[PDB]
Amino acid sequence: MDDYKRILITKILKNEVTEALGCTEVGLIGYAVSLCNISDPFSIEKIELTLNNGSFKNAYAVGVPNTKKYGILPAVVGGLLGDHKNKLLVFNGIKYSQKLEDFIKERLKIRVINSPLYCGVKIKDNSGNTFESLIKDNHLNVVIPKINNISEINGSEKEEYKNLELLDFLEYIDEIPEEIIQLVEKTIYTNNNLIKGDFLNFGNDCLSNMVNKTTSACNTRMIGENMPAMSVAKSGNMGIMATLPIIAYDYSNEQNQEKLIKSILLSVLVTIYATYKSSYLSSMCGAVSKGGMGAVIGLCYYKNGKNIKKLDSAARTFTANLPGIICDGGKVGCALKLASGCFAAYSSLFVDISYENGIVGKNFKECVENISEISKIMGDLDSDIVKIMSK
Amino acid sequence: MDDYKRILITKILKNEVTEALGCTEVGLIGYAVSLCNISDPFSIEKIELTLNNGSFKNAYAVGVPNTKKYGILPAVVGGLLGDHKNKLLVFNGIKYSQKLEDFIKERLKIRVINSPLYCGVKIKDNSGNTFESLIKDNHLNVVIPKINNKLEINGSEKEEYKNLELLDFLEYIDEIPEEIIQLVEKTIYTNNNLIKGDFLNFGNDCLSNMVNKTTSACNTRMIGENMPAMSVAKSGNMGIMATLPIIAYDYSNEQNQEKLIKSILLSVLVTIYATYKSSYLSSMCGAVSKGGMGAVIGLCYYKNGKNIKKLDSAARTFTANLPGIICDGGKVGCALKLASGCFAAYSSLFVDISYENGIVGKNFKECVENISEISKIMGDLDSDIVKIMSK
Numbered sequence A: 001m002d003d004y005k006r007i008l009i010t011k012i013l014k015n016e017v018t019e020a021l022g023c024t025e026v027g028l029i030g031y032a033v034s035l036c037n038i039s040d041p042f043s044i045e046k047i048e049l050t051l052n053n054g055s056f057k058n059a060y061a062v063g064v065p066n067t068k069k070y071g072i073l074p075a076v077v078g079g080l081l082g083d084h085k086n087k088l089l090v091f092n093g094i095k096y097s098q099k100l101e102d103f104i105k106e107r108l109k110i111r112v113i114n115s116p117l118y119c120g121v122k123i124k125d126n127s128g129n130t131f132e133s134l135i136k137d138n139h140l141n142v143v144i145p146k147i148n149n150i151s152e153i154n155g156s157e158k159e160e161y162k163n164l165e166l167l168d169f170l171e172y173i174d175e176i177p178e179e180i181i182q183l184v185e186k187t188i189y190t191n192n193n194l195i196k197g198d199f200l201n202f203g204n205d206c207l208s209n210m211v212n213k214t215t216s217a218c219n220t221r222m223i224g225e226n227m228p229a230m231s232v233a234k235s236g237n238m239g240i241m242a243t244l245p246i247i248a249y250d251y252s253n254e255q256n257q258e259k260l261i262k263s264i265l266l267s268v269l270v271t272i273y274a275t276y277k278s279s280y281l282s283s284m285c286g287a288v289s290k291g292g293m294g295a296v297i298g299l300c301y302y303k304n305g306k307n308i309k310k311l312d313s314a315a316r317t318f319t320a321n322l323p324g325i326i327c328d329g330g331k332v333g334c335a336l337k338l339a340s341g342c343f344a345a346y347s348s349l350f351v352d353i354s355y356e357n358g359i360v361g362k363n364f365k366e367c368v369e370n371i372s373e374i375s376k377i378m379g380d381l382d383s384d385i386v387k388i389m390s391k
Numbered sequence B: 001m002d003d004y005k006r007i008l009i010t011k012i013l014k015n016e017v018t019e020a021l022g023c024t025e026v027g028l029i030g031y032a033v034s035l036c037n038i039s040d041p042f043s044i045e046k047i048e049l050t051l052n053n054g055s056f057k058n059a060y061a062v063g064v065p066n067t068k069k070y071g072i073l074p075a076v077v078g079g080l081l082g083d084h085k086n087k088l089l090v091f092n093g094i095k096y097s098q099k100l101e102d103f104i105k106e107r108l109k110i111r112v113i114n115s116p117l118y119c120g121v122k123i124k125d126n127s128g129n130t131f132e133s134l135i136k137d138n139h140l141n142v143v144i145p146k147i148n149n150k151l152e153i154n155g156s157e158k159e160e161y162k163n164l165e166l167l168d169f170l171e172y173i174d175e176i177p178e179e180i181i182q183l184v185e186k187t188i189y190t191n192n193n194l195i196k197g198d199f200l201n202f203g204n205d206c207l208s209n210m211v212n213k214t215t216s217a218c219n220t221r222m223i224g225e226n227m228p229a230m231s232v233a234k235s236g237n238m239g240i241m242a243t244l245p246i247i248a249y250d251y252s253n254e255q256n257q258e259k260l261i262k263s264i265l266l267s268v269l270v271t272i273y274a275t276y277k278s279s280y281l282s283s284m285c286g287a288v289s290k291g292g293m294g295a296v297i298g299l300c301y302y303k304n305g306k307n308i309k310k311l312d313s314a315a316r317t318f319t320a321n322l323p324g325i326i327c328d329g330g331k332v333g334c335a336l337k338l339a340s341g342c343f344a345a346y347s348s349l350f351v352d353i354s355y356e357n358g359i360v361g362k363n364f365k366e367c368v369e370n371i372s373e374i375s376k377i378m379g380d381l382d383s384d385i386v387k388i389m390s391k
């Protein structure tokens, strides 16, 4: 309808919807290690990787791409075996060497700190030369190798998007640009390609299929497969949680192409909105919360159409069900949490919760605001989580 | 099994498994208001009710018995229309007056504080007379007009229970005392009687029945029905979460009486164990976590018997799945959380999660310890929750 709204929404959709190969933390580690640019990885005497609590937590037991392994050492080995030009896709075209893994295991000294995103590599060789590199802050800004390159959008556009209402999103999915239609279809393609086998199929009903497909894709992403995931705000698990429940609901129901496209577009819009509103860092599972808000809004739009009260009731029930949940790092178990998210969405399509019930917001906007504020209230827990995992 | 162990377990089961009549918070409010003993409720100029964060949270939007209403204002009206001699049962035999509700709404000024259980009523009338009442610490201890009440099992027995292992519980459910069998049967009867209709039934399969029955009983308990619930550690919703999933699994499967008895007994033992180990207060949903640990251990004992690795895998998957959910007070939405708990239990019976996946413990005891530690780390946080709910 309005022109500026369509332009802003299109630009932000083109900005936030990317292709992420596995977890951004292991990619970060490999990219920093390749930014050190070691000429001979077998001439290394000591490697000193420094991470913050969140990075160490997320990368402790997540699958490293093209290594068939888990942990931070495979990411460091892949960075040694990678090229900086691939940036976050550092693990492309590599040939994993178990010999180099055994070589670096004796020399990789990892040290954790309490701070925002921090990734500092300091490598020494046999000759004595030292090579340092550092990536800092939430935006992936390299401060030592100085290699200009992620996914930046100025604050004015973010503030203008935060001031949009759900009716703007409902009117956008009726006037979808063709480029955005292809982007949504590419999203569906990328996230559906992540379905590899059965992980949690306990029936043939709709919720069973939703849980099964979502957990299968999450397990595929967590075991270190060389397959990208269509991520919103560089969080692939959030994109999985936002898309696959709707994909499996549509697969179990009408099998409508345009309808699934519109529902997933609305889900991505809602997920981007919830990510913007949750401005502060948090140890709460942002994937489950945000991607599930997007998924439940998309499922409610699929079930009831452009019904405002239905969407508000779905948001209220989702806020009542599963708000506040730990983010104990990238793991194979993360899939389970997303499974719960599926539940949290499905059960919200059949129950209405009054606004008085606890932290439930008055409508969708207040639900998102309350979830974001609670995420802010939970505060920094990554220090205690990393202290737990060290035992 | 050892004799002292059996005696301790029997004593702790008889102590912790009680019968709780509805929600205690609205009873507290009504009793404090009725202790003022207002002769004419329509001669009131202003009421000043003071609660602490926890009390305000739990009583903000919970159903008041015999009022057909929700919130703190209905509790205040029922206390004005009740007699102090009824103590926590102030709402018995009353006839709710909407006129008095509309009168008191204009004059009830509620103020929240940071302290243990605190309920102070200060009413003024047209003549100028003032009436004060105050309840502090435990529920039954009113300090104004000075009717002291001191709050069963010494700490040594709790510590001895903390040092028990899951094998002790598995051996206890084979030599059950007859009194304990009667207690389990009364528990099953009481908690199954709370099922009034369908609240979240989206099928006739096992998980559908589990979620449906659990949510139905929780909704019955939350709307203010005059029906007692068999509570573990005075938390009726925790007892529901611990018992009803197993009841509905047995209902949908083998229909075995003794097997269900043993499974629910093990669930209650596990729930008491998790409550004892989580000694510090927390705003995390203790009902879901503890009762669901009990429920998943009971379901795994029902499915696989006295298999240690099966129980360890179920506990690990439960710990990976749904830890750290908010406890935003007693509400109709609480049922949803318990529904999620059902999910978290069922999905743990078919998946194994490695201990490396985040906060997952090496076995059952380590899982409980990590969950308790995270609960302790989350702290109080009730002040921020009530600040959110105040809008």
Ligand code: SF4
Residues within 6 Å of the ligand: A058, A237, A238, A284, A285, A286, A287, A288, A326, A327, A328, A329, A330, A331, A334, A337
């Ligand atoms: S728990 Fe959620 S937010 Fe945390 S790593 Fe797993 S998917 Fe991401």
Ligand code: SF4
Residues within 6 Å of the ligand: B237, B238, B284, B285, B286, B287, B288, B326, B327, B328, B329, B330, B331, B334, B337
């Ligand atoms: S949110 Fe959880 S802990 Fe709080 S009252 Fe409801 S069931 Fe109990």
